[PDB]
Ligand SMILES: O=C(CCCC[C@@H]1SC[C@@H]2NC(=O)N[C@@H]21)NCCCN(CCc1ccccn1)CCc1ccccn1
Ligand SMILES: O=C(CCCC[C@@H]1SC[C@@H]2NC(=O)N[C@@H]21)NCCCN(CCc1ccccn1)CCc1ccccn1
Ligand SMILES: O=C(CCCC[C@@H]1SC[C@@H]2NC(=O)N[C@@H]21)NCCCN(CCc1ccccn1)CCc1ccccn1
Ligand SMILES: O=C(CCCC[C@@H]1SC[C@@H]2NC(=O)N[C@@H]21)NCCCN(CCc1ccccn1)CCc1ccccn1
Ligand SMILES: [Cu+2]
Ligand SMILES: [Cu+2]
Ligand SMILES: [Cu+2]
Ligand SMILES: [Cu+2]
Ligand SMILES: [Cu+2]
Ligand SMILES: [Cu+2]
């Protein structure tokens with residue numbers, strides 16, 4: 251089993267009120283759904299990612315990342331977000347991320363194609 | 376089938392000489408391997424991602440993203456990179472990305488946990 | 501005078517314990533010193549930036565940015581950070597930023613030259 | 626004088642056709658104007674920044690950064706861009722940057738306040 255397979259698997263919430271439901275596999279896989287509280291989004295979207303299944307034991311966090319393409323049966327916002335970050339275990343477990351949201355654009359608009367931000371996920375709220 | 380399922384599936388190379396081997400599924404899935412020409416990496420790593428399987432038809436690119444956790448049977452660099460970008464079809468097909476590489480860190484080093492950069496992938500070289 | 505010239509001018513502290521001392525000019529100038537609580541830094545460094553001296557009146561924040569080159573009379577870490585963000589006035593005034601720290605590198609190391617993060621500055625602590 | 630004071634001072638052009646006019650001071654100051662070929666911009670905008678006036682001599686680039694607030698006598702786009710990067714001297718001198726563009730937003734829109742991209746500046750074109 252991955253060191254934090256148990257710690258990562260479950261439901262997570264970020265500061266925007268979005269919901270991140272993920273299953274961590276023993277091999278390093280992340281699978282689940284994402285529901286955004288903001289933007290051109292409704293209901294759940296497929297996500298997939300990877301995490302370090304054998305992290306350092308020196309108190310470092312666990313690196314991970316995942317992607318959502320913002321197309322589902324209800325909407326298509328022609329964009330994708332990737333979250334890159336680390337899982338920090340303990341009493342107040344957290345997944346601390348920065349993210350890149352890229353929209354499909356024409357080449358003349360490519361310079362404004364990508365948003366960057368940061369989301370913190372907790373097990374509560 | 377996804378509009379660019381055929382266009383995305385295959386082998387891609389970036390400006391660093393890294394090799395991105397991907398299969399685009401009809402549902403929006405990305406699966407494959409990544410081989411980095413630089414950094415604490417050797418041989419192939421598992422990747423997974425998502426792409427917009429029904430992009431706009433107005434000449435916009437196709438949004439996509441994917442993740443590599445830098446653990447395989449040879450090495451574990453306790454880090455993960457996510458690439459967020461868009462596929463641009465045509466004679467000179469390109470995948471234009473920006474990426475976030477997060478290392479597992481202690482909390483005292485979390486401020487220096489994340490690199491950002493940009494990779495351009497072409498079908499040749 | 502700039503709408504938030506008075507609001508921005510003064511001493512600010514971020515979540516790392518760093519100290520941001522700035523004077524906002526009527527023309528949009530930012531001048532001051534930065535003292536980082538972390539990294540290859542000691543004492544104060546010169547900073548300069550710009551802010552929107554006539555922001556929207558619809559409740560939006562005030563865009564601003566500034567740069568520190570990490571050379572002073574004590575140390576030279578051959579790097580520069582730029583903070584890009586917005587000032588949010590009111591009872592709990594905040595400057596919410598994301599930043600890019602670029603080190604001078606050889607071309608072979610340019611892919612790992614740039615860190616990205618996010619700092620929140622408050623008037624207290 | 627700053628090692629690359631002479632190398633940096635002058636007119637630079639990026640891949641979008643924007644024009645970056647800068648004077649590097651002996652102390653590490655950057656002063657000049659920026660004219661963007663794209664976006665909500667017309668004519669020249671004030672910029673200010675900092676650079677490492679005593680870079681490493683091992684072939685590394687010279688770290689630097691600068692800010693433009695997008696207000697001038699013609700327009701106010703209530704936003705600011707910071708470019709963070711390094712100057713690389715030689716026959717084909719380059720300033721390689723990544724940038725963060727933050728718009729003033731309401732707090733409910735703060736999650737989509739910041740664009741990220743990358744500009745390469747050359748002495749010609
Ligand atoms: O909303 C979406 C999908 C939802 C994205 C939710 C984000 S993921 C990061 C964050 N953490 C989270 O939990 N939730 C948010 N994808 C298109 C994102 C278009 N813009 C903003 C929204 C919008 C809605 C309607 C019309 C226009 N926009 C991006 C802003 C932009 C940038 C550049 C040029 C033009 N517009
Ligand atoms: O190399 C790795 C895995 C390979 C990553 C390859 C990158 S993905 C983006 C890009 N596109 C590509 O095709 N290839 C590169 N993961 C740890 C990344 C540690 N640092 C740099 C390398 C290193 C090797 C040995 C010892 C120390 N570092 C990141 C730099 C850093 C940042 C903050 C604090 C300390 N160090
Ligand atoms: O510390 C500095 C200057 C201090 C920077 C402080 C940052 S500004 C953003 C943030 N908000 C804040 O208030 N404070 C921090 N500039 C070189 C930054 C080298 N690395 C990390 C530190 C270090 C100290 C000694 C030896 C090696 N590093 C960056 C990590 C890295 C990235 C890629 C390859 C290798 N290393
Ligand atoms: O254009 C500007 C100022 C010009 C900025 C030029 C950029 S600096 C980085 C790059 N290198 C360069 O040489 N040139 C470009 N500042 C507002 C930037 C609003 N959006 C895009 C333009 C626009 C024009 C009219 C109406 C709406 N937008 C940013 C996209 C966005 C993001 C999030 C939510 C909504 N919109
Ligand atoms: Cu180890
Ligand atoms: Cu968009
Ligand atoms: Cu806009
Ligand atoms: Cu559509
Ligand atoms: Cu690292
Ligand atoms: Cu370092």
Ligand SMILES: [Cu+2]
Pocket residue numbers: 556701
């Ligand atoms: Cu206005």
Ligand SMILES: [Cu+2]
Pocket residue numbers: 579602603613
């Ligand atoms: Cu560095």
Ligand SMILES: [Cu+2]
Pocket residue numbers: none
């Ligand atoms: Cu490293």
Ligand SMILES: [Cu+2]
Pocket residue numbers: 576681
């Ligand atoms: Cu030195």
Ligand SMILES: [Cu+2]
Pocket residue numbers: 704727728738
């Ligand atoms: Cu904007």
Ligand SMILES: [Cu+2]
Pocket residue numbers: none
């Ligand atoms: Cu939008």
